[PDB]
Subunit: 240 residues, 4 copies
């Protein structure tokens, strides 16, 4: 079984992606922010995956995790960079930390993990790098300058890497979710959530499985001629 | 008869044929259209139990209405519509005639307007629908001599966004698939050298295949793409990245 | 004194463009839909322009008008294709004539007039084709499928023609207005117009002079290295 | 006079921008990487500007420079963020420092300087933030993942900030140069430079003045209804 690495697989979009790639036939290593989180992933995946703890802000941990996968399971041939943490603020309340942490978790992590898996994909002459971006990289809102800059940077990074790796048949793409229902949108008010769905042409929030379906498509042999693109999964919230 | 009905225009060969065969594999009853009766019979022969062939000149409103009415009477409402046209009439602007302009805009863009309009009722009633328009990399990646084809394909993509907004509340999705350089009977006929200059522009360093486009259409037509609408799915091997 | 042709120059954006290009030093031929309209343009422009009647749906009139300009004033070296007529309708209610007329007035006219001025620009080693597009070619809303398709077609047409004419230093660009105040938006309600400006980051409708400023920039020697682009003038209604 | 701050004004695009804004009537503070560089700027600008040394990687220096301008000349009402340094490499050879330094010089500097000038623009009910991006944020090439990600991040940052500041009539835009002739491209071979111009529809490299013209347009009252956009100045190298 080819190995897929899905960061942030504990819940929501990351969990749905990891479960779908298992259904597709991959051996899935999912990462969590803690050891207890990783054990819960290990329990859930059984025979067909493994859970590992990973702080994606940490280069040493990134390297230790990929080395561990290589030693125990095989080369990482599908990499899904999945982060959703936000630190929103209007610009003159947006601190240095709020800026730096979001750029590090989202964009620097994509640079570091993509770099680290290139060797094994190159040797296999097969690879899928699939980056979770956001509608926000294209549909501007106040208070999200750091998240928006990080996600747009990810999409541009992906285009340049797609050009570098294309001749060896490795594809590099992004999936850009719109408003996806999560445990915290469940926590929002009824009214705030309606204000969200009224902007969506399909008139509803999406589900984590919608994003997992798009990632599964790109990771499969049905998408072997797609590289350097953004796959928008937002119900018509943003159309391009 | 009891499967959902898909209508694929221009299904005789290449991308259209691959789309029609893939949607049959997916479980749709596929009506494919050809430019002549003998072409339609060959589609009928190929599809058997799981589709039908009909002759259709997509420049003709009367034929568009007769074909969809025939499908409604004999098979069911059109719930997946794939608008597929590939004819070109390239020329630098100084040599591009009124006919060269009008015919390309009519075959590509007007046909999308007419056929989309005609299937809206049945999709609305079913509260399910997929309209999938075959666009082109050329709507975004400019090159000389294609002003009519490029304008038509870009118009299709903008049309699709408008219609996606109109139909979204009824869960009908409207999307485009934009092929890059796809190998066809006609690129097979080109020289070795001309075809190399094509693939050297592609990041994956090869021409695509009709099945690559069929795979993308199949994805969008499925329940795996129910939250995707108003988008362009680029299938060009990195020839154009957006 | 170089000749500029501005279609639909009677009022609004077209009038502001024509007056600005006169200030810039061009001899401006403006067109109107009737002879009395053309005479009003002639009166307004005086020494520095002329008014002509032109139905842009008519190839014979397009040819007669450009030939008349060539015979009496000089080659058309700046062409501004300006049309604003709409025939909005949900697709259900959008007739063949509503579709055909909008595509003919907006997109076919750009094809016909651009084709007709190429010779003189080619011979002069200088040219500006500036097409008035719209935010609507990019920012989708229901009921405008014909207008949106026509404007997007214009932008794609312009890219192809920019590639064809670039070696001879002729530039081909589009200007895409957002919500611009007109006699027609003056007539709307107070509430409807507020519902427009609240979507604009600058929190106001634009003015015809804003579009004239953008056209003037592109028509000048300050924009000689800009071709095949869309210049968005929408106050942040749409950002790309 | 209103004060404009142009970073990296010693040569090339930055120098042309600074000289053009002086011609437009601004008092221009230009920055250089050293004190001797700043003195040269002071000598060149005379009565109509000043030179200051600034390492844009340094928050303390950014704060000291803007405070110095506020104390001696007036509020910064036009900010031009101009950086061109590259640290290209295929991803396996792209070090942590190559990534971090480019993201800091280009994108973090835009965040820090934009944040620092917001107060004075807000108080004046007038402002222009103009960020020098690049064609590379859109036209992917191998070996530039860091530069491309930084420039795309700048464009997304600008859209978010344009939404935030729009009601106060402050505009935030980017100018994206293509292949512009520099001291650097003068040094390239004849053949390599031809490889560049053959990709340009206008069949030539641009000049620093072409970028200065675009910045001058956006900084003027001729562009008061343009915000959150990218102005592409690339001769048709990339068309959108």
């Amino acid at each position: 079984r080819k190995v897929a690495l899905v960061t942030g697989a504990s819940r929501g979009i990351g969990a749905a992606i990891a479960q779908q790639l298992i259904q597709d036939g991959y051996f899935v290593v999912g990462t969590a922010t803690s050891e207890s989180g990783a054990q819960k992933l290990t329990d859930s995946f059984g025979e067909q995956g493994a859970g590992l703890a990973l702080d994606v802000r940490n280069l040493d941990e990134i390297e230790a995790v990929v080395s561990h996968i290589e030693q125990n399971y095989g080369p990482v041939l599908v990499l899904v960079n999945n982060a959703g943490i936000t630190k929103d603020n209007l610009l003159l309340r947006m601190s240095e930390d709020d800026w730096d942490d979001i750029l590090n978790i989202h964009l620097k992590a994509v640079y570091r993990l993509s770099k680290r898996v290139l060797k094994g994909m190159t040797k296999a002459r097969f690879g899928r790098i699939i980056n979770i971006s956001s509608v926000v990289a294209h549909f501007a809102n106040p208070g999200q300058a750091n998240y928006s800059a990080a996600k747009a940077g990810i999409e541009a990074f992906s285009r340049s890497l797609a050009k570098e790796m294309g001749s060896r048949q490795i594809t590099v793409n992004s999936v850009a979710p719109g408003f996806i229902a999560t445990e915290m949108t469940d926590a929002l008010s009824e009214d705030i959530r309606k204000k969200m769905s009224d902007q969506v042409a399909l008139n509803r929030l999406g589900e984590p499985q919608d994003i997992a379906n798009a990632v599964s498509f790109l990771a499969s042999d049905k998408a072997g001629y797609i590289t350097g693109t953004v796959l928008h999964v937002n119900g018509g919230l943003y159309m391009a």
